Amino acid sequence: TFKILTDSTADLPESWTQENDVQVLGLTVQLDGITYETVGPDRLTSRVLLEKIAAGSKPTTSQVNVGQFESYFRQSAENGQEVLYIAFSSVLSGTYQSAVMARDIVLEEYPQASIEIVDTLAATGGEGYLAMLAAQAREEGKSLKETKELILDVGPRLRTFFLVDNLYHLMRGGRLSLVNIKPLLWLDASGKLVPIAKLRGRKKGMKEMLKRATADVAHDTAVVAYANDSEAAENLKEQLLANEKIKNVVTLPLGPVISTHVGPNTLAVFTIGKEAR
Ligand SMILES: CCCCCCCCCCCCCCCC(=O)O
Questions:
Q1: Relative to the CA of 95, which ligand 1 atom is closest?
Q2: What is the CA(142)–ligand 1 centre distance, in A?
Q3: Domain count, the chain
Q4: Among the atoms of ligand 1, which is closest to the Cα of residue 225?
């Protein structure tokens, strides 16, 4: 019944969205004078992005435009279809607010139409997992309202711990001895980015991230994301799966919009606690 829409910052694999009937509106990357798509056959990849960033290219990102949500929303209302939009955190992008404005314009044309927008206060794998729980609820025949309620319950309980090389691109992007120091960050209850530890070295950074992620597990699945290093993510995966509470691990490469902000060698772990973080 209801359609599920998300955005390219949820970092869902194309194969998953195709097979799961989830649509994705692309944010853009501005990279050395050109605007790249982040969805479609011509989408910019993180591998290409990070390569350019290593040679000194300072790429910036842009929100989804009101027009994109307009078209999608209007097409759905025209077709008698309900819509759930699992949205990239409102505190990191004006994407959510543009969708809200687009919904306003469409409800003018289609006053009885059904369009729910969830401000996940999330990012990348976290956001993606929320969409995955939303596609699972849809399978189980939950309504749009019930699915909205599920995501609004789960979202505040999602933990996001992420380990970076430094704060350079994070501070450069506007959303935020140091030799061999790996900062560890999280998203607080407001969805704000907040350093919580500075580890001497990647092995310690990972250990700490694993410890914090596994402090409070109330759900059998964890998510690991990585910028560059797929073997490092595998090591996180194995460790996670060694918790009796963790039965599954979803592993997702970071997409280029997120990668533009966090930088290379980023690792992240997403888990769901019993209570709201
Ligand atoms: C693995 C990293 C975890 C992600 C948690 C948040 C990381 C900060 C990323 C900021 C992304 C901001 C993208 C802004 C898009 C836009 O231009 O509107």
A1: 18
A2: 30
A3: 3
A4: 1
